Amino acid sequence: KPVSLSYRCPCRFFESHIARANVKHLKILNTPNCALQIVARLKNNNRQVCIDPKLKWIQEYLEKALNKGRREEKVGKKEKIGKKKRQKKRKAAQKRKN
DSSP-derived letter for residue 84 is: S
Q: 18: exposed, middle or buried (C-beta count within 10 Å: 0-12, 13-18, 19+)?
A: buried
Domain ranges of the chain: 1-70
Q: How many CB atoms lie within 10 A of CB 39?
A: 16
Q: Which residues contact 55 (CB under 8 A, 6 or more apart)?
A: 16, 18
Catalogue the E-assigned strands of the chain: 23-29, 37-42, 48-51
d(CA 69, CA 7): 22
Cβ atoms of residues 39 and 25 within 8 Å: no
Q: First and final CA of the chain: distance in angstroms?
A: 61
d(CA 4, CA 29): 22
Q: Does domain 1-70 have CATH number 3.50.50.60?
A: no
- Which technique? NMR
Give residue 90's Cα distance to chain centre.
27
